[PDB]
Amino acid sequence: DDFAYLNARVRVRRGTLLKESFFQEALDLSFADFLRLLSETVYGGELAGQGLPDVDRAVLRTQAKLVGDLPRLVTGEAREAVRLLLLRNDLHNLQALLRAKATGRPFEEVLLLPGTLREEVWRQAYEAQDPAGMAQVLAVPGHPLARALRAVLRETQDLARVEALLAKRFFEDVAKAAKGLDQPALRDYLALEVDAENLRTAFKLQGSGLAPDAFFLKGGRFVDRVRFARLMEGDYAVLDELSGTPFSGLSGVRDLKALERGLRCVLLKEAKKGVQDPLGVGLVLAYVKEREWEAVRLRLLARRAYFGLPRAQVEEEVVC
Amino acid sequence: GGLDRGLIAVGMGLAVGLAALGTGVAQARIGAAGVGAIAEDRSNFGTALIFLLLPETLVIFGLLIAFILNGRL
Amino acid sequence: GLDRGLIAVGMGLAVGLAALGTGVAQARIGAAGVGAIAEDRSNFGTALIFLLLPETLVIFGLLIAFILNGRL
Amino acid sequence: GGLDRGLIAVGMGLAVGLAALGTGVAQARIGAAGVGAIAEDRSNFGTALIFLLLPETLVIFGLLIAFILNGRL
Amino acid sequence: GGLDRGLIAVGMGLAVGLAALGTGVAQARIGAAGVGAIAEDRSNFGTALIFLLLPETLVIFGLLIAFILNGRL
Amino acid sequence: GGLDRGLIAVGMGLAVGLAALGTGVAQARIGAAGVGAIAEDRSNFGTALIFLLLPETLVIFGLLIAFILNGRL
Amino acid sequence: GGLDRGLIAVGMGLAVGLAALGTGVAQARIGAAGVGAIAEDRSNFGTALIFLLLPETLVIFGLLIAFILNGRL
Amino acid sequence: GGLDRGLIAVGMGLAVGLAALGTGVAQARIGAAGVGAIAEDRSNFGTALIFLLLPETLVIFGLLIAFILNGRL
Amino acid sequence: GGLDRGLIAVGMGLAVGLAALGTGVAQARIGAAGVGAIAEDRSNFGTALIFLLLPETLVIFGLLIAFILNGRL
Amino acid sequence: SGGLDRGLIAVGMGLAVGLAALGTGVAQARIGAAGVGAIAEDRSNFGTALIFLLLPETLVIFGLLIAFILNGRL
Amino acid sequence: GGLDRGLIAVGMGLAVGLAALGTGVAQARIGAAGVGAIAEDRSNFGTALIFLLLPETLVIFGLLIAFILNGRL
Amino acid sequence: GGLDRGLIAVGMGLAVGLAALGTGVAQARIGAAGVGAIAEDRSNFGTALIFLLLPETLVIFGLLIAFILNGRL
Amino acid sequence: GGLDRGLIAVGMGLAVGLAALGTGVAQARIGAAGVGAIAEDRSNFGTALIFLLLPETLVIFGLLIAFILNGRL
Amino acid sequence: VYAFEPVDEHHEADRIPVVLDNPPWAKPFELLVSFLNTPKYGTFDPTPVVPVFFPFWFGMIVGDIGYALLFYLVGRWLSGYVKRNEPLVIDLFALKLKPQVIGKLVHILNWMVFWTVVWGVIYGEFFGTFLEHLGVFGTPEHPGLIPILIHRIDTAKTANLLILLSVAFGVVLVFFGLALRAYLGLKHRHMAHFWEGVGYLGGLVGVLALAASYLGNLQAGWLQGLMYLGFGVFLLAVLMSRIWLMIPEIFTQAGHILSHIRIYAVGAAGGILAGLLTDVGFALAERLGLLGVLLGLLVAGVLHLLILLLTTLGHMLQPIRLLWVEFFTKFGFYEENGRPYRPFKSVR
Secondary structure, X not given: OOOOHHHHHHHHHHHOOOOHHHHHHOOOOOOHHHHHHHHHOHHHHHOOOOOHHHHHHHHHHHHHHHHOOOOOOOOOHHHHHHHOOOOHHXXXXXXXXXXXXXXXXXXXXXXXXXOOOOHHHHHHOOOOOOHHHHHHHOOOOOOHHHHHHHHHOOOOOOOHHHHHHHHHHHHHHHHHHHHOOOOOOHHHHHHHHHHHXXXXXXXXOOXXXXXXXXXXXXXXXXXXXXXXXXXXXXXXXXXHOOOOOOOOOOOOOOOHHHHHHHHHHHHHHHHXXXXXXXXXXXXXXXXXXXXXXXXXXXXXHHHHHHHOOOOOOOHHHOOO | OOOOHHHHHHHHHHHHXXXXXXXXXXXXXXXXXXXXXXXXOOOOHHHXXXXXHHHHHHHHHHHHHHHHHHHHO | OOHHHHHHHHHHHHHHHHHHHHHHHHHXXXXXXXXXXXXXXXXXXXXXXXXXXXXXXXXXXXHHHHHXXXXX | OOOOHHHHHHHHHHHHHHHHHHHHHHHHXXXXXXXXXXXXXXXXXXXXXXXXXXXXXXXXXXXXHHXXXXXXX | OHHHHHHHHHHHHHHHXXXXXXXXXXXXXXXXXXXXXXXXXXOOHHHHHHHHHHHHHHHHHHHHHHHHHHHOO | OOOHXXXXXXXXXXXXXXXXXHHHHHHHHHHHHHHHHHHHOOOOHHHHHHHHHXXXXXXXXXXXXXXXXXXXX | OOOOHHHHHHHHHHHHHHHHHHHHHXXXXXXXXXXXXXXHOOOOHHHHHHHHHOOHHHHHHHHHHHHXXXXXX | OOOOHHXXXXXXXXXXXXXXXXXXXXXXXXXXXXXXXXXXXXXXXHXXXXXXXXXXXXXXXHHHHHHHHHHHO | OOOHHHHHHHHHHHHHHHXXXXXXXXXXXXXXXXXXXXXXXXXXXXXXXXXXXXXXXXXXXXHHHHHHHHHHO | OOOOHHHHHHHHXXXXXXXXXXXXXXXXXXXXXXXXXXXXXXXXXXXXXXXXHHOOHHHHHHHHHHHHHHHHOO | OOOHXXXXXXXXXHHXXXXXXXXXXXXXXXXXXXXXXXXXXXXXXXXXXXXHHOOHHHHHHHHHHHHHHHHOO | OOHHHHHHHHXXXXXXXXXXXXXXXXXXXXXXXXXXXXHHOOOOHHHHHHHHHHHHHHHHHHHHHHHHHHHXX | OHHHHHXXXXXXXXXXXXXXXXXXXXXXXXHHHHHHHHHHOOOOHHHHHHHHHOOOHHHHHHHXXXXXXXXXX | OOOOOOOOOOOOOOOOOOOOOOOOOOHHHHHHHOOOOOOXXXXXXXXXXXXXXXXXXXXXXXXXXXXXXXXXHXXXXXXXXXXXXXXXXXXXXXXXXXXXXXXXXXXXXXXXHHHHHHHHHHHOOEOOEOOOOOOOOEOOOOEOOOXXXXXXXXXXXXXXXXXXXXXXXXHHHHHHHHHHHHHHHHHOOOHHHHHHHHHHHHHHHHHHHHHHHHHHOOOOOOOHHHHHHHHHHHHHHHHHHOOOOOHHHHHHHHHHHHOOHXXXXXXXXXXXXXXXXXXXXXXXXXXXXXXXXXXXHHHHHHHHHHHHHHHHXXXXXXXXXXXXXXXXXXXXXXXXXXXXXXXXXXXX
């Protein structure tokens, strides 16, 4: 309820963050210097021993300890708004869980990376008679995933096309909840995220040549459906047509790796404007996205120190 | 005739009540932020108490004006 | 016997708006205190002190009401 | 000489009503946070009830001022 | 009778109305959180009803004050 | 001659108006949460309707106060 | 004479206006959530309209009190 | 036959003003949700127009009470 | 004339001011959602203007009530 | 030559103008907030934002007309 | 006149105060969005200051009304 | 003087009070955005202080109106 | 004191109370942002306290008007 | 080669460290001085004005001699704790304090309580109103003992003089801060801040002169050229600066000068509260029965201790907050925060 009581702990968490020089010093190490620098970091409290999977589990536990509490301790419309921040991990968990349910593998075979719901609910949802019953088992009061499963559940029982329409309706329900919320910053942030995801899907569907109207979604502000068709076709001039929008440097780039890098850079630049509202909820989402970018960069530095990647090999990964 | 002391006391009471309302309106957000800071860490309790005590001057000036009106009463 | 009721009406408005401001502070105070208590049991006394900090407006309103009653 | 008992009753009623308004303004967020905590866990329902019952002193003081006015009436 | 009866009646009416306003302001977010908890689980419906009915003490005190004003009228 | 009837009518009118204002202030958030629960599913429609109609007790008490004022009138 | 009749009309007007204010403040978030549920699906307009029409009883009771005032004057 | 027409006119003015205030208070969230649904889908304009026009009953009752006041005037 | 004309003008002014307040209260959220839709799409200006101008009926009715009051004046 | 009605008419005209300006400012708050957000988004719909901002002035114009009618019939 | 000038000054002061209240209510969100845009870039300070000064016309009209009241004082 | 001087003082006091209320209502969001920009960067203090001090012209006009009332007093 | 002194004290009390209300309304958001900045870092506390104490000229002008009313009485 | 080269000049001293270097009589206020940031290493050290004025304003704040005796008892308890040489441990406060900070706090409490007992003798108030029983103050309504300079109960002869004393203290502090800012600008040879301080002083002087002329008393002949010269000096410094430090800045400085009456306000409020509590307790004890004076005096002491624990923190904080808001901000004290003197540790 109180958008400032959580923001106080958010500012206290934002005071405890690694500097850019901590990543600049990580460009020259031997993973033992990186282990010692991680032992001095705030994430090092979950650091058990030495090794790449131990460091990965420590980074995951540190992210769950530093970001997972913000999904808790919230109430009402503030809780419903903050629920639409850590939604991608639970969506991927539910997607691979539905894929395993359609596959028939063991319930302990899945990894089940941390989301926003109870893990015992995900364990009980491994065996269910109907997918609507599994959604009712996984039903929270304000989670949009349960309502999206109830909406898209009137197609079949369990299909891969049902999972694709579930992901599309999950993005559409995120956009609808952003339209239905009183927050001038998070709505535009989610709209830019949806538009960048649509552009990434247009890049990832290049060469398929199928009907993009089924592939495209709704909710974006910088892209058009004719622009989506021109991006589905081999027309990088439409990518040059994105003038004035957040896709400023994103122009004429045919490389999908560079396209996703520029998309992540534009997303981090848009989330860096989240410090403008010090009384709302956008600063907490900005701190969450900054911790996520720092954790992805820490995992990249850990992989580079493990397998001996050059600093030139990671120079395209520390631009922002 | 006898409509002076009651009106003066009514104005002083309106002053004290609206000053207490404004002081509580400030103290709501002040104490909410201070309690969130204390729940974040137990290291800035005095700095939060400083922000909690910074807003009492409005109610203090209201009580001073009420005492001045009572001296006029 | 005309201004005798006006002073009582002003004292009543004073005590009522003082309790209104005290409850307006105590809303966010008790909200943050209950959120801290739901976070951990180790933050009970500081939250109780922060909740009790709002009683000064009620004390000043009761003092003004006692001053008006002595004037009454 | 008349026109004083009704004014004192109106003042006591304004006191009781605005004290109930402030107590309700506190108890709104109090009961909302308590219901959220009880939905979280049923173990801390007693501390939630104590925090909810802590705002009753405003209504108690308003009833005391109304009783003092009724004694004056 | 005269105007003091109507003045005391107006004071009791303003008391009851502002007390009901404060009671509804308390009941709003409390019933919102209770309906959210009932949508979460129907097991805590009794605690939800208790948290809903807990705010009516201000209404009971306002009804008592209005009855005292009617008895003094 | 006397404005006692108009004064009692003004008091009962302020009573009924502020009581309906508080009832509507409760019913806004109550019906928002209940409409969210109904849009979730039709499984708990009865308890949601009970929680919606639960705010009518303050309006009933205010109507009793207004009927008592009319009987005094 | 011309002092008692206009005050009753003033109180009836204040009652009707505050009742309409409370009814609109209730219906605002209710209609917002109902339009959200209608945009979610074109199948739940009935319970949405029921929850919308549920706030009309306060305005009906206020109109009944105003009709009682008009029967008095 | 003194301050009667002006008092009845002041009451009808307060009635019409607070009724328009409540109608606008409903219409704010109503038109916000309706514009959000219209931007969501052009096919949802009719239900949004119905939800917008549903709030006019308070203005209709206020105009009826004001016409009753003018007939009393 | 006396004093009924000034009170009638005061009530008409209260009507016009509170009706404009309610119209602006609706038009705030109306224009906010309309500007959001206009920045979203340029093909929604003709409906945003309709949603904005739909709230002017309260101001028009208040102007009509003030004109009826001035004609009574 | 009103003695008490002349003050009451001026008080009513002042209350009308003040509450009309309050409603116009309450509208223009969210109006200018959304318009400034759109202008910081892009410098393209500044004229439409100005039109949406100036659309609220009809209430202030009607309140000023009511005050002018009160000053004329004073 | 010992009653007309004070009432006219009260009306002019209420006009100026409520006009400044509405101007500040606009300027709050206006300056919030303008300071956000200025923290975004310094290239948009002119239109931001223009939108900030756009609320001054209501205060100018209120000052003109107060000057007309002082001329009629 | 007599009834005119105290009424002019009440009008000047209501003017200054509502002007300070509107100035603080602007200054809340103004100082919120300014302190947010200051926590963003310490080099934007000039435009933040300019936007903070821009809203004091309404308080200056209210003080001028109160000084004109005192000169009339 | 008669009618002039009580009404002058009532106006000074309304001025002081609403000035304290506006000052606390600004100071709530100001102190919330300042406490957030202090919990963010213990390096911008000076500018935070400066911007916090900047919302005091309204209370200073209210104390000045209160002294002017106490001297003019 | 131990090269003891000199420090930098008034310009270009950025990485240079900073130290207090104050008198040992004023060494105890170092924690309160260093609660904020550091100066510009060539900025005026304002720590002496803290011990000059915060005790003098704090004695005017709290004038209860019984509260001074309770403070002396608590200081004796803290002195015994410091003589025990144990660390001050408060687990619910999470406050671990060394004996040096506790000894500095005890010395500051003694230096506060001396002037506090002096002003309580000036106010004639011991534990609230103990003069209701034995009239140690001498009033014309009831002469019990020697006369009080301030009766501290009525304000008909006290409020104007108290407001004048608070306004004179605030104006003197504002003038001292403006003079210190102008002297530091002349020392650093930065004529912008020097002209700004001179113009702010002239505008404040002209504002006070025109206010005392128009809204104050009669005889508007002597200060007419004073107000004209003040407005002219303000306009001339505005032309000499052209920095748009407008009438908003002058009004903010004037409000910071006029905010010193809050000390007299809080002192009168605490005195009225303590006098009302003590009068109600003494009345319900002696005049109501004269035998429940034990239980009545116990309840009165409990209520007085509760009111003291509720209000004395803010009553002590408001003077130091006003000092930090006036003497620092009038002299600047918000530029670059200084660099700390961090030598080699040898933590031992």
